[PDB]
């Protein structure tokens, strides 16, 4: 089983160090045939990414012919590209794709999955969402039981700067160490909400089946005019939207602290919630990992 | 595809329930062939059980020869049986099992699955922890990661008493309480004394540790009227390499398992990537049933 790895940052380099440390039998006859980033195209596993050719994704793809692509590279959310048309050509050939990348998901899922599922071709998102935490995992496990509703935290540095906040600290003094700890850089791309709205974006489409895209959802973020508040990620049948609100002692969602996600969700038998790290390179790459084995046991 | 359904009390109840309300479309050639309790082997699928036949369990799986035994009947700790060797026999048959019944699994864990995996037969036994909630099927989904350790609340009758103590509530009245909802019989010496509890890290600690305990291995204590007070106090399962236990503790209030209330269960998994906690209701006929309907859709998918 040959791979395409799309993306050598962080994830693709945690990627291709959990392939190699050999963790699950389902494992043994997957290699890497090609990595290729901006910089073009290595045509051999290495650890260090030195290209061998010049050219983008889809050269790459052309010439290995993969049987999976695996797509970790930057979320361009302008227009998904070019994993949005990626995709639909790896699909169209049976490829299949495992991705950590929000952006074709956030912008395009049900001209994504309805395509897939036409053709009967897997997709593996884990990593989309909370990382390496089942989350669209989660789901895969729940069978049998319609999704009324989901609610989440789904972006790690709002919610440390806001369990600051809860604990007498100042917007500005939480922020600053948000800053200080490298969880914020102008923040304000940072502490907008437009992370968790990527993220119930992708979860609604999947849970729900309500086809939605980024711009269906009214998104906010924190700021010094807040006054314990989380952020909250919330959909359902009729509405997407993320939005700091109190949250009651009452609520599972009450400890879920720092950095820390957590996805609630509320089905016809019953309400559970899942909490993990939601963030980190070995963390995602372990998402896309987990989705690799799936996909060999045939279980996506 | 043929079940037998071994137990027919609240759980199998809600299972025969669940199935008839369809809710998948893998399961549409599913069928009960046969229903064996105490009582005798109802040789139909009906929503009252009516005995056909005197006979027992082994009775009815040479009679209906079935595809599936999916078991939901009382856990038997003295020795597993009869259960345990109808696994057993059913394994070499090449049948799978669905099971909600902890007592062959606490008390033969890898003999069964190593029987198991030499037959290529499938076992689900998510009904057996934490009821409907992802526990065993949580950590199916979590492949390719080394469990360091588990910690959780795993009894709902506990965690109900131990809740309504924190309110000022007596523990005789918690206990009443949790009888009167179907939580404890008249004599409730053996549902509190924290043995489910046990059984449930037992299965844990084998399935997610490769920690080959039967309920012998684990040190357990249970709850009563003479807990510290002052103190929120949950019955806390926990396993790693070298030890599995279980005993009531005061929570800290940054501990995520102190709102874990009522019958909430809750698992908290730390591996080599990452610590995880997951949360859901951990009793109730329908959840219990939930988990075992779960269990069949996915062999269905054959993804056990
Ligand atoms: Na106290």
Same mark, same amino acid.
């Given at each position: ?35 290729? @980033? ?11 990414? @030195? ?82 935490? *089942? ?21 790690? @540095? ?29 923040? @304000? ?37 807040? *006054? ?23 609520? *599972? ?23 993990? *790290? ?23």
């Amino acid at each position: 089983m040959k791979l395409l790895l799309f993306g050598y940052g962080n994830v693709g380099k945690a990627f291709r160090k959990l392939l190699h440390e050999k963790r699950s039998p389902e494992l043994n006859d997957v290699i890497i045939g090609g990595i290729v @980033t901006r910089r073009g195209i290595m045509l051999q596993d290495k650890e260090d990414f @030195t290209p061998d050719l010049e050219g983008d994704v889809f050269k790459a793809f052309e010439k290995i012919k993969p049987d999976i692509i695996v797509d970790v590279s930057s979320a361009n959310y302008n227009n998904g590209e070019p994993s949005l048309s990626l995709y639909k050509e790896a699909i169209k050939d049976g490829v299949n794709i495992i991705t950590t990348n929000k952006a074709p998901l956030a912008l395009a899922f049900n001209e994504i999955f309805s395509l897939a599922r036409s053709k009967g071709v897997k997709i593996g998102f884990q990593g989309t969402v909370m990382s390496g935490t *089942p989350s669209i995992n989660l789901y895969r496990v729940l069978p049998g039981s319609r999704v009324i509703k989901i609610r989440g935290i789904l972006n790690g @540095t709002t919610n440390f700067i806001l369990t600051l906040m809860n604990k007498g600290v100042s917007f500005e003094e939480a922020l600053k160490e948000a800053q200080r700890r490298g969880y914020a850089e102008d923040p @304000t791309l940072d502490i907008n909400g437009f992370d968790a709205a990527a993220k119930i974006t992708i979860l609604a489409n999947f849970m729900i089946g309500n086809s939605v895209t980024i711009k269906d959802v009214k998104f906010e973020g924190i700021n010094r005019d807040l *006054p314990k508040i989380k952020l909250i990620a919330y959909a359902d049948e009729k509405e997407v939207w993320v939005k700091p609100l109190p949250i009651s002692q009452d609520d *599972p969602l009450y400890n879920v602290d720092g950095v820390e996600n957590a996805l609630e969700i509320t089905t016809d038998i019953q309400s559970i919630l899942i909490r993990g *790290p939601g963030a980190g390179p070995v963390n995602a790459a372990y998402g896309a990992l987990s989705d690799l084995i799936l996909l060999k046991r045939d279980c996506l």
